[PDB]
Design an enzyme around this catalytic site. Structure first.
Site, PDB file in Angstrom:
ATOM      1  N   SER A  19     -12.637  22.941  -5.443  1.00 44.58           N
ATOM      2  CA  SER A  19     -12.208  22.432  -6.762  1.00 44.58           C
ATOM      3  C   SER A  19     -11.676  23.619  -7.666  1.00 44.58           C
ATOM      4  O   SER A  19     -10.832  24.362  -7.193  1.00 44.58           O
ATOM      5  CB  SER A  19     -13.367  21.612  -7.366  1.00 44.58           C
ATOM      6  N   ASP A  36      -9.682  21.712  -1.345  1.00 47.47           N
ATOM      7  CA  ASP A  36      -9.069  20.781  -2.301  1.00 47.47           C
ATOM      8  C   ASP A  36      -8.971  21.414  -3.712  1.00 47.47           C
ATOM      9  O   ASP A  36      -9.712  21.020  -4.643  1.00 47.47           O
ATOM     10  CB  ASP A  36      -9.758  19.406  -2.315  1.00 47.47           C
ATOM     11  N   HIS A  69     -11.859  14.059  -2.279  1.00 47.73           N
ATOM     12  CA  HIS A  69     -11.973  15.427  -2.826  1.00 47.73           C
ATOM     13  C   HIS A  69     -12.937  16.290  -1.998  1.00 47.73           C
ATOM     14  O   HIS A  69     -12.529  17.325  -1.439  1.00 47.73           O
ATOM     15  CB  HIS A  69     -12.463  15.354  -4.285  1.00 47.73           C
TER      16      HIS A  69
HETATM   17  N1  LIG Z   1     -14.755  18.164  -9.103  1.00 45.39           N
HETATM   18  C1  LIG Z   1     -13.794  18.049  -9.722  1.00 45.39           C
HETATM   19  C2  LIG Z   1     -12.597  17.955 -10.516  1.00 45.39           C
HETATM   20  C3  LIG Z   1     -12.622  17.204 -11.708  1.00 45.39           C
HETATM   21  C4  LIG Z   1     -11.447  17.094 -12.500  1.00 45.39           C
HETATM   22  C5  LIG Z   1     -11.394  16.417 -13.818  1.00 45.39           C
HETATM   23  C6  LIG Z   1     -12.537  16.196 -14.659  1.00 45.39           C
HETATM   24  C7  LIG Z   1     -12.380  15.671 -15.973  1.00 45.39           C
HETATM   25  C8  LIG Z   1     -11.077  15.391 -16.510  1.00 45.39           C
HETATM   26  C9  LIG Z   1      -9.966  15.678 -15.676  1.00 45.39           C
HETATM   27  C10 LIG Z   1     -10.113  16.195 -14.382  1.00 45.39           C
HETATM   28  O1  LIG Z   1      -8.698  15.415 -16.064  1.00 45.39           O
HETATM   29  C11 LIG Z   1      -8.146  16.189 -17.033  1.00 45.39           C
HETATM   30  C12 LIG Z   1      -7.042  17.015 -16.693  1.00 45.39           C
HETATM   31  C13 LIG Z   1      -6.430  17.805 -17.691  1.00 45.39           C
HETATM   32  C14 LIG Z   1      -6.915  17.729 -19.016  1.00 45.39           C
HETATM   33  C15 LIG Z   1      -8.011  16.884 -19.356  1.00 45.39           C
HETATM   34  C16 LIG Z   1      -8.635  16.089 -18.362  1.00 45.39           C
HETATM   35  C17 LIG Z   1      -9.779  15.229 -18.698  1.00 45.39           C
HETATM   36  C18 LIG Z   1     -10.844  14.904 -17.913  1.00 45.39           C
HETATM   37  C19 LIG Z   1     -11.822  14.034 -18.560  1.00 45.39           C
HETATM   38  O2  LIG Z   1     -11.911  13.924 -19.787  1.00 45.39           O
HETATM   39  N2  LIG Z   1     -12.620  13.390 -17.699  1.00 45.39           N
HETATM   40  C20 LIG Z   1     -13.673  12.432 -17.993  1.00 45.39           C
HETATM   41  C21 LIG Z   1     -15.076  13.058 -18.048  1.00 45.39           C
HETATM   42  N3  LIG Z   1     -15.225  14.102 -19.070  1.00 45.39           N
HETATM   43  C22 LIG Z   1     -16.464  14.887 -18.864  1.00 45.39           C
HETATM   44  C23 LIG Z   1     -16.689  15.985 -19.922  1.00 45.39           C
HETATM   45  O3  LIG Z   1     -16.579  15.362 -21.201  1.00 45.39           O
HETATM   46  C24 LIG Z   1     -15.280  14.833 -21.488  1.00 45.39           C
HETATM   47  C25 LIG Z   1     -15.019  13.686 -20.484  1.00 45.39           C
HETATM   48  C26 LIG Z   1     -10.296  17.820 -12.085  1.00 45.39           C
HETATM   49  C27 LIG Z   1     -10.266  18.586 -10.904  1.00 45.39           C
HETATM   50  C28 LIG Z   1     -11.430  18.637 -10.113  1.00 45.39           C
HETATM   51  O4  LIG Z   1     -11.387  19.331  -8.944  1.00 45.39           O
END
Ligand SMILES: N#Cc1cc(-c2ccc3c(c2)Oc2ccccc2C=C3C(=O)NCCN2CCOCC2)ccc1O
Ligand SMILES: N#Cc1cc(-c2ccc3c(c2)Oc2ccccc2C=C3C(=O)NCCN2CCOCC2)ccc1O
Ligand SMILES: *[C@@H]1O[C@H](CO)[C@@H](O)[C@H](O)[C@H]1NC(C)=O
Ligand SMILES: *[C@@H]1O[C@H](CO)[C@@H](O)[C@H](O)[C@H]1NC(C)=O
Ligand SMILES: [Ca+2]
EC number: 3.1.1.34
Lengths: 442, 83
Positions: free
Chosen positions: A130, A154, A239
């Site tokens: 990740s 990944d 993933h």
């Molecule tokens: N393993 C893994 C893994 C996980 C992600 C991932 C997690 C969260 C993402 C996300 C990507 O998308 C993006 C991408 C760009 C910008 C913002 C954004 C927002 C959230 C978002 O708010 N998710 C909802 C949950 N959140 C938790 C914290 O509190 C706020 C809400 C990406 C790559 C990975 O390898």
């Protein structure tokens, strides 16, 4: 000493072959006595497991599994687990930012081991999952000398797809960079897994979009309606599969899965990419052949839904001969393969177009080790309730030969009809072909 | 020692192979014989070629007797009923 390292937020546990799940012993940067306390073997190689993004701040289920497999495959090595859970537990773009800091922490730790103990960096293997794949890339780009290998499991796509080489994992980050792309579904920069190649070798299992056993197939998806969502995304199945594919490769040293260089996933799914000449094929995982090419090489393969993931790939070429000109669209067939060892009957496949006096190539894959191929049964499927009847008029083709190329053994086999021609008639009995030639491609 | 083998594809029982090819170094002579019932009744066929890996076998795949034979002499791969 220690004073010059306290700013390092990351922790480094030397996990053991008997204590795999816990961060019992820590390697404290600037405290050389901590290395002896943990019983680091200065003679053996080192693996650095770097986790990724987490909403919980706890190590996931895969961490002891990966540590355990590295110690099964390499029992005398040092398996270090990097703790950056606080920084990996923020809002995604913020943790994405922290990959620079974690990369720096790791590089300083590595550079310390070398300065203090004259430990060779050529003995270091970085495994990053990740965001950890990019933390590994940044670490590699900041060490005094180049680390031997970096495995990207990944790598994170959002905010990295369009990032420049110093801010993300790239091939200059180590002597060898291998990357498994397993969840690339979605628009570019909007996929969870990075889409672009970032290593010397970039393997895309099952096209890399999603993994078998992980998604909710389109049919189930349509029927479920407004209810179901993207469970695969949420559960992180596809993933995480890159970690299980890597683990599989460590537990099956003697039988690795082979990946095949290809222009596109669409070309691969036509069976056009199945060669091993000029490094056009490689082994997925640990036993990879460290071939650094001029250009980023994208590689494809199919896998099973569960461990051991290996399948056998075959390209099948058929010339559909006939007297009268006819064109059929989206036709369903079944192919049955009979070998020396075993058999795999009724393997379905469909063709978008079937036309008189044209040749069609397609990929057939199977879990079964059938051995050396002897017989081939081909069925042209009908869903009509009258297909059984000899009164029912059904289209047909005369097929003389079937050319098959086995990817794993690199063998071209020709199968030819028992009579002058085998009649393949929609909804009827299967056409039979028996082997009439072999050719080792080497 | 370089071998010459008979190279013919799915020939009917009563027909002898005319084609002969010089094998690559390390290669052996092989004969595949299929025998089972078809739409045109019972049928026996033979195919012959230069193979690399040669494994003699006799299996009855989907009610058809398949027999594979190897030999290291030149032009030796001739079906039993033709030797
Ligand atoms: N393993 C893994 C893994 C996980 C992600 C991932 C997690 C969260 C993402 C996300 C990507 O998308 C993006 C991408 C760009 C910008 C913002 C954004 C927002 C959230 C978002 O708010 N998710 C909802 C949950 N959140 C938790 C914290 O509190 C706020 C809400 C990406 C790559 C990975 O390898
Ligand atoms: N706001 C907010 C918000 C966000 C979450 C949240 C839950 C789960 C999250 C998560 C966010 O992050 C993302 C974010 C994007 C994509 C994936 C992902 C994965 C998981 C994850 O742990 N999944 C694995 C689940 N386990 C599978 C194996 O078995 C044990 C269960 C919860 C409460 C909230 O108020
Ligand atoms: C270190 O590793 C080597 C294998 O390369 C092994 O023989 C030796 O016993 C190990 N020593 C320690 C101190 O673990
Ligand atoms: C297909 O080719 C054969 C000769 O190989 C010929 O007899 C037949 O007419 C051709 N079919 C069409 C539709 O032209
Ligand atoms: Ca980089």
């Amino acid at each position: 000493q220690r004073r010059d390292f306290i700013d390092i937020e990351s922790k480094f546990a030397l996990r053991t072959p008997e204590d795999t799940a816990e961060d019992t012993c820590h390697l404290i940067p600037g405290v050389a006595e901590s290395v002896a306390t943990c019983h680091f073997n200065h003679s053996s190689k080192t693996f650095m497991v770097i986790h990724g993004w987490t909403v919980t701040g706890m190590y996931e289920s895969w961490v002891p599994k990966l540590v355990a497999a590295l110690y099964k495959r390499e029992p005398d090595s040092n398996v270090i687990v990097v703790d950056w859970l606080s920084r990996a537990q923020e809002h995604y773009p913020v943790s994405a930012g922290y990959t620079k800091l974690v990369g720096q922490d790791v590089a300083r730790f590595i550079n310390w081991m070398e300065e203090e103990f004259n430990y060779p960096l050529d003995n270091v293997h970085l495994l990053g999952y990740s965001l950890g794949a990019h933390a590994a890339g940044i670490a590699g780009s900041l060490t005094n000398k180049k680390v031997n290998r970096i495995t990207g499991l990944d790598p994170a796509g959002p905010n990295f797809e369009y990032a420049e080489a110093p801010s993300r994992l790239s091939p200059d980050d180590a002597d060898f960079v291998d990357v498994l792309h397993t969840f690339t579904r979605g628009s570019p920069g909007r996929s969870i897994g990075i889409q672009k190649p970032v290593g010397h070798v970039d393997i895309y299992p099952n096209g890399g979009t999603f993994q078998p056993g992980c998604n909710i197939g389109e049919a189930i998806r349509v029927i479920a309606e407004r209810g179901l969502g993207d469970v695969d995304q949420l559960v992180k199945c596809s993933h995480e599969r890159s970690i299980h594919l890597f683990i599989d490769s460590l537990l099956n040293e003697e039988n690795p899965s082979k990946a095949y260089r290809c222009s596109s996933k669409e070309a691969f799914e036509k069976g056009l990419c199945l060669s091993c000449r000029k490094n056009r094929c490689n082994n997925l995982g640990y036993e990879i052949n460290k071939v650094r090419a001029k250009r980023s090489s994208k590689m494809y393969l199919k896998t099973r839904s569960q461990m051991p993931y290996k399948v056998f790939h075959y390209q099948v070429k058929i010339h559909f001969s006939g007297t009268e000109s006819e064109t059929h669209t989206n036709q369903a067939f079944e192919i049955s393969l009979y070998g020396t060892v075993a058999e795999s009957e009724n393997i379905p496949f469909t063709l978008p177009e079937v036309s008189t006096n044209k040749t069609y190539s397609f990929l057939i894959y199977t879990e079964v080790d059938i051995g050396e191929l002897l017989m081939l049964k081909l069925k042209w499927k009908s869903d009509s309730y009258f297909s059984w009847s000899d009164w029912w008029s059904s289209p047909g083709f005369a097929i003389q030969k079937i050319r098959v190329k086995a990817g794993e053994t690199q063998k071209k086999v020709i199968f030819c009809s028992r009579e002058k021609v085998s009649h393949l008639q929609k909804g009827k009995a299967p056409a039979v072909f028996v082997k009439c030639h072999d050719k080792s491609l080497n | 020692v370089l071998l010459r083998c008979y190279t013919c594809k799915s020939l009917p029982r009563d027909e002898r192979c005319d084609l002969t090819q010089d094998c690559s170094h390390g290669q052996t002579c092989t004969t595949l014989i299929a025998h089972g019932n078809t739409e045109s009744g019972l049928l026996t066929t033979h195919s012959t070629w230069c193979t690399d890996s040669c494994q003699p076998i006799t299996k009855t795949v989907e009610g058809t007797q398949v027999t594979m034979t190897c030999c290291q002499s030149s032009l030796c791969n001739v079906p039993p009923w033709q030797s």
